[PDB]
Design a protein around this nucleic acid. Structure first.
Length: 86
RNA sequence: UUGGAGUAGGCCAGCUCAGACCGAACUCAUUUCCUGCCUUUUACCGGAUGUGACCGUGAGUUGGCCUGAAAUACUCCCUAAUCUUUGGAAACUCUCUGGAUAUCCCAGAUU
């Protein structure tokens, strides 16, 4: 209640966005609603982007910052690399 | 952790089974014989042998009665510190092998 719990609770109270890099090499921009002792995350207005290299006709193409929008999202605590309270 | 199926206790009455221990208990009668006592019978003696009755018992089941209780409850069926669900991931190159075999691709294996 004086550390990571304080950061997650402050994010919950302020309803501010976090930028999360995750173990699938992916990047997330979403708001904070709730957290637990496992630091599992429930998310809103989620913008998910990632780097994908399309294999055009057997040749390595330039990467795409492919992104999607998810309304409501739930996240697991062990899948996190880093969270930044933006 | 649940949905599905359940509903009390006491008492009374009926029905069906139960002895190899229904019964940790114990009587009576009687068939066919043997013994005894006997003038005839009944009422008897006491052994065998089967056969009935009576005083009782248990389990299941069905109906009723009495007192409750009442969306309560019980009853069944069923259900993030290493070592397992709280992660070395994710991504893909290089090399090797096979198919194709001029390559791309892909599979397997390795860093």
């Amino acid at each position: 209640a004086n550390g990571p719990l304080s950061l997650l609770q402050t994010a919950v109270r302020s309803h501010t966005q976090v930028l999360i890099s995750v173990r699938s090499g992916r990047k997330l921009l979403a708001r904070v609603k709730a957290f637990d002792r496992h630091c599992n995350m429930i998310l809103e207005n989620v913008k998910e982007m990632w780097t994908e290299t399309p294999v055009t006709n057997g040749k390595k193409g330039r990467p795409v910052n492919k992104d999607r929008f998810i309304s409501k999202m739930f996240l697991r605590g062990d899948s996190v690399v880093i969270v930044l309270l933006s």
